[PDB]
């Protein structure tokens, strides 16, 4: 599928509402494995299990290890652009 850019809106007290797997040390993209019901990723309607996260907020995640991707993702606030692809 095509690259999509999806805007997620989260309030400061909530999480992103995703679980992720993969990353550079696994030789596969950062991948959404869960979408948590009622949380920001669920609510925006444009993020899905199976999506690769290529970038978040202009931060390239194509070549980032899992832990660093988790950290960057967890630092995001407010209106957040996800660059994703389901290949």
């Amino acid at each position: 599928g095509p690259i999509r850019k999806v805007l997620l809106l989260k309030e400061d007290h909530e999480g992103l509402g995703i679980s992720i797997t993969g990353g550079k040390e696994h030789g596969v993209p950062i991948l959404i494995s869960e979408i948590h019901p009622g949380q920001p990723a669920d609510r925006c309607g444009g993020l899905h299990v199976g999506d690769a996260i290529l970038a978040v907020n202009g931060v390239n995640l194509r070549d980032t290890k899992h832990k660093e991707a988790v950290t960057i993702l967890s630092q995001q606030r407010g209106e957040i652009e996800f660059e994703v692809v389901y290949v």
């Binding site: 999480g15 992103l16 995703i18 679980s19 494995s33 948590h36 988790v70 993702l73 967890s74």
Partner: peptide, 4 residues
């Protein structure tokens, strides 16, 4: 998986 990590939860975020």
């Amino acid at each position: 998986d990590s939860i975020i």
